[PDB]
Amino acid sequence: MKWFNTLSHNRWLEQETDRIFNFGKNAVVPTGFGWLGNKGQIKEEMGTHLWITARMLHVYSVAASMGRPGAYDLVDHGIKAMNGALRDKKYGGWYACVNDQGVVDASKQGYQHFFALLGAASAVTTGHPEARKLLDYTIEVIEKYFWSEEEQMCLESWDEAFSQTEDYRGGNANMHAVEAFLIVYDVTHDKKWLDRALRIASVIIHDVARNGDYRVNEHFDSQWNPIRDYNKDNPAHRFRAYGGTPGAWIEWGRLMLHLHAALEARFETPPAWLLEDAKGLFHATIRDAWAPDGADGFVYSVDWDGKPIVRERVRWPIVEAMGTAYALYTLTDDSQYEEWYQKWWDYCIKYLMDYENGSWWQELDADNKVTTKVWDGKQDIYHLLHCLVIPRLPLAPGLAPAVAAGLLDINAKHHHHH
Amino acid sequence: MKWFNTLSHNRWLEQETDRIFNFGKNAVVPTGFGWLGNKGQIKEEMGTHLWITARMLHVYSVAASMGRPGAYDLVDHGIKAMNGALRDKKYGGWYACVNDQGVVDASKQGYQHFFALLGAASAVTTGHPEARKLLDYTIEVIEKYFWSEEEQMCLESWDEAFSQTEDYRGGNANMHAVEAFLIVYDVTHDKKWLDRALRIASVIIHDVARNGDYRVNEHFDSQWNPIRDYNKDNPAHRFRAYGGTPGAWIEWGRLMLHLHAALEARFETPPAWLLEDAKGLFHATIRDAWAPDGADGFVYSVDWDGKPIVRERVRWPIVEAMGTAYALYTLTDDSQYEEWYQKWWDYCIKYLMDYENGSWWQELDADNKVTTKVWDGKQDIYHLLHCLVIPRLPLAPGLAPAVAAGLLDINAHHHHH
Amino acid sequence: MKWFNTLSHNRWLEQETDRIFNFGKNAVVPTGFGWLGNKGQIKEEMGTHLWITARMLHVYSVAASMGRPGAYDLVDHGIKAMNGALRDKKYGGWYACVNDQGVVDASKQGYQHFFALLGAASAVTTGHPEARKLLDYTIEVIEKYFWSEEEQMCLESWDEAFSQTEDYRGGNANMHAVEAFLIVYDVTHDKKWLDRALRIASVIIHDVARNGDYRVNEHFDSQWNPIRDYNKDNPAHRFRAYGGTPGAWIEWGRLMLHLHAALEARFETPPAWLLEDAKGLFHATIRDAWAPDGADGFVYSVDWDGKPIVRERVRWPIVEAMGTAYALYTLTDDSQYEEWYQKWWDYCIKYLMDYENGSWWQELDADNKVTTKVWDGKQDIYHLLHCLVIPRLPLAPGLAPAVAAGLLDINAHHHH
Amino acid sequence: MKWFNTLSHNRWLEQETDRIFNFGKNAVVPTGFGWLGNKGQIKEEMGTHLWITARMLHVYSVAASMGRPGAYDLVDHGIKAMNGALRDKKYGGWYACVNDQGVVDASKQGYQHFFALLGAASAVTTGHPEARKLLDYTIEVIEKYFWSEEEQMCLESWDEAFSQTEDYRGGNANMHAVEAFLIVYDVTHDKKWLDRALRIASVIIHDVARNGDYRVNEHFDSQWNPIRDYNKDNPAHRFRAYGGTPGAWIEWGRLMLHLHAALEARFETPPAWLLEDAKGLFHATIRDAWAPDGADGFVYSVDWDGKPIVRERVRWPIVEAMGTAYALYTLTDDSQYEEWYQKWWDYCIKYLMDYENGSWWQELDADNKVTTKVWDGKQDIYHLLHCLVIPRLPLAPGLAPAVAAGLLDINAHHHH
Ligand SMILES: OC[C@H]1O[C@@H](O)[C@@H](O)[C@@H](O)[C@@H]1O
Ligand SMILES: OC[C@H]1O[C@@H](O)[C@@H](O)[C@@H](O)[C@@H]1O
Ligand SMILES: OC[C@H]1O[C@@H](O)[C@@H](O)[C@@H](O)[C@@H]1O
């Protein structure tokens, strides 16, 4: 069965994408974007998070490029929010969480600042007259506090006043740095952004993960030595789970293929390890995490021997798996990847898609029934673009640049025989 | 006005197709696919029919090839049903009807086995790893019990244990054999299937129908002699109506054009009678059955002088008419066929389409008001692909193969030359 | 940001178009098309208006050409209606308004007859076997009573019997004559239709509007001299507002560019003033009417110095502005026009589109909140095709002909 | 076998088209275009003929629209020529033939003036700044002297001073009037040219030819009564052959289908007889004139019982047959027309194409061997566009307009 690069499948994806764009519109709050619950209501107690606001700015940049009325107003809202309450006008950068009445979390989180970077870079592709100013400012914050020239890797977090950095180094924030750096590169061609991306991946993936059967180590000390037992007593942490989180492995895989494609796009032969390691991560994710416990789905985390720990099926791991299947199919022409993509789509409509309340469920238990454990509500639509829009685009340039360039369905041009 | 081979019209068709796919999803039951009612609910008392289950397997094969998440799971469900409760594990083939408790109708119905053949052949086009095995098994059953080598025609039915065949021969079962054989040909490229289809059409249409003003005779004895009086006392029978059923005539017309196109595809000149007789069937259907009684719509049945008998407007006849209009337009380029297609679409949205309760009504009275008489519920969506998907495809290969091949919209200043 | 001539934007446009076609279907009544309210219900007390019936005939002609089942039945219904109760079978032409009991308004309104002409011409593009007959008759009525050979302009209205014409000449009726004449030209090529359209535009726009900073004068006496203070006492009139109605200025702009494109289509160099004056009208509209009073949106009317009078934001002016932005973008390649189009789409979804009850609101107050003041319900869908379908087509031939020709998306990018 | 609307066939067509364009370029002379011989040199003794200069103006208009460097210079050359020595500044219109020291044939030939009209209308499609002026003037001459309002038909010829008209009416000149009128229509979108074309075809074809087994009568007296024995003593005349000339019958067929398509293009139902009679003419041409005498090819003339008179195979009849086969295929979708087109292409390359000396031979004997009898030289490339370019275009608008519109290969399969 052929779905990739078919207009019939791609029309289905677009129509679902519009349903998703509609869901996120409910998140608009004066200081940015709020946290949506299971019925698409704002959970006011959660306030305005930096990472959510930046993600929505990115999402509505893509929607704007797709020619959807109202989306550009959300881009504008996003850019205003990044210049408003979220912005620390004393020490620079952005607070982690604010609301109409003040700052709740003033800390300076690297993970969230890389999303700020992605949001600004994607906003630039819309031509919004204030987007490039925002990007330039974000670059200054990143280079001052979050890219380490000494370590040639990303730092994790600081206090409000940028006086003390966290005694921890994280694969997760570094992963989203790679993601953001790809798009910054697409809207600058300052070579350093791609160089930095390759460097980060070489350390986290080609060195550490590859040497552990492609089980990505996320937690390191300040000297970049793995802390294997980090969070052993808080294993279901939302951002720093104990052990391996296979959803991240497979996401890394796709990011490495965007890097491969960006190198190809400047007529450079990419290093072979990008594709090799992307295959490795994909294979490892299925090996350990797909249906390991008597029911379909991807578990949330595994121990260092591949045994599941948190068995809940969170939404984003399978969504990322679908994106990576597409990226691997694109580079390999191997139908096995398409078969996995299809299998996962069937699972998604069966268990995760929520036509009744809107969007998709965020989390299921080990029997694939809606649960509340790891998460609380439906606060994200950003990951969904990776299974809804990415499969309609080349791998270079990246998501927002490629949509703005008019590349949707560009490759959808007798597929049962040769 | 141009609709055929326009992306605007074809987009509308696709959007309606998705509405129809959605309606059929609630038919899923442990033993296969159940019988949906007017509001999309399962009518439990009807059980799990072989023909319905096989048709759904076919429909969701097309949906799967169209890239709809969930459709492949329904293909898988259908294949499991065909390997499970519906399959006669003792004597082979498939029971006509089952439920959770056991067998409701143990008979071995040719009509329904030809749908099993279609369903398996369409499933093959999805690449499902169990589909070819199913097709192989279905072919074995068909050649053992339902294609007669001596008659060079299809048998009608057997009892559960295949001890004796029915003393009756049917144009209806044979029509759906042609339909299935076309698709088996597409997934085998073995001319024997097309040889058989052409042979069947040559007897029922080119001989008997053509010599009867294109009024197709459906009921025959075992020597393939017409029984003109069959079911006089049960005229509104769902599968064996008394007299002629014009919806069937026009359906035969399309099938003959698929056959024509299949021959052309391998650079063989089709016999001229396929097109000639398709024209005759289409014309005769309009002649006897279109608006014959002071209101629009196709009547269900007519006597041998063309006079209406059962005057209800059932859904499938007009749907088939629309499919045949497309096929004839494709072969002739004659705009009259497109005009009919358009007129029929307008009728369908006015009277048949049911946006309130789902799908389309199954049956209307002679004033085009919803009724319950010949039928009971909304158990079919298979026919609707003939007015929704067929117009988006060439005539060769057939429906499911062509969608799998990526041919949707391939043919799409058209107000002048 | 690129939207014009992109399949992603055009798909969004088509899907909204279908939503709009669905809303109008509820307007069917035995005598034509009735007046839809905010819920898509018929407002029976409004009866069956000639202008509404003719507009719906036009709208469903386009829907039919787009391959929508049922639309042709609505064309058929409109044609029957134009041969039924609405037709004055005694004196000729069509009554302004009828109902199931008889004639409500027997007068013969030029404005509404030009819509009859448009409807018939659009219907011809469907091939409906009674459409050409309707067009031919409509042309006869227009040439007898509405196109003046002595004035080389359109007359305004008459009594039922066509015995006395109104002592008034109108820019508004003449504008919609231009619109109708373009489509009659498309389905005939009697040159006179384009000649007449150019003549009308040359008087109302090139002479009078251009000389008044592109503020179109609508109200004239029988000698075609402006009546500047017409309807001072009734400034929010639905068809003859006091002063300038900027939505009409921008509508004139687009029509002139359809005229331009028609001339190009036959390998003729169009007169330069069509584009020059389209630019002038567009600019003047932004200058006087866009967000002139501390909130977004187009006001309804302005005085002769460009100051707002009626500040309500009616639906059709912004819808027409979007159409004209597309036309100007097409001719100039200047992205400022695309930027305006996008800005206005954002405003429309924010304030005008009504996904709850259907269609779009007809009218908002000066703070962009839905109101009832100038208008009453949701009786029109015709204008919406100018921001939904027009951006998917070339400028020649016109709307219904172009859709019938299969030209949707024919023209459908961050660097050179 | 499928050729029509295939890119592979159309590429072959374009490549031959370029070889043909190249051959014509040597015809440039100071006063217009000269008469090319068998090896592509100028037959200087023939001087500059109006019909040749006008045809070359048309051909290079098409070449220019196709983006061939040098072609526009020839369009400019042709326009200058039509304003130079060929132009009668005293009495108006154009002399039939001039040379570098004066007028050779001062007569005012209708046949040649309809080609002047075609050449000007085609030149307008290139946007050359002097082309519209030329067309406008040519129209004035045609309407003064060559279209008769009284007869509703075209006259044949006049003396230099337009004092007396020839006591003769010709189906040939009228055929080329139809041809020219189609293109004038295309660059004016004005009804009257099509009305005139339809009227002309209705008389020559629907009345006279249809009632004589589709054998077109060409020679008429001043009352439009046939002269059946005209040119009995000069049967092989180049423009007025005795009896019927089947090449002309099949050419009429295509022109009627361009007429049909033009009507369709403005959403008008064309009269059924255009297609009926086009089929009739095509069939009759094969019936009487295709391989009638034991070898392939179309004879030049037949008598009124269909028997061949002049048996030479001149180039243009089969070239026109091929164009008509395309037009009939386009309207009917009947493969028999494509089969004939293919058969004729095979004959053309076997016997007519001249890769050695350039272009195609003008004339063969009854055994398909190159001969000199009816004609002398290779002065024409105009007909060749009817088998080289026409099969790559829709039937409306006509040749030069369609190429200028970007329509080449727009329509470009073993089963249904
Ligand atoms: O959407 C939130 C999730 O995003 C993924 O890419 C990872 O960064 C996870 O750690 C995180 O919980
Ligand atoms: O959908 C069921 C119908 O299918 C048609 O093709 C015919 O076989 C009818 O006899 C039958 O009732
Ligand atoms: O839709 C109704 C409106 O149409 C516009 O084009 C103008 O004619 C207005 O005066 C009128 O109120």
Ligand SMILES: OC[C@H]1O[C@@H](O)[C@@H](O)[C@@H](O)[C@@H]1O
């Ligand atoms: O090319 C010259 C020829 O052109 C044809 O169309 C006819 O007019 C002939 O009579 C003429 O000899």
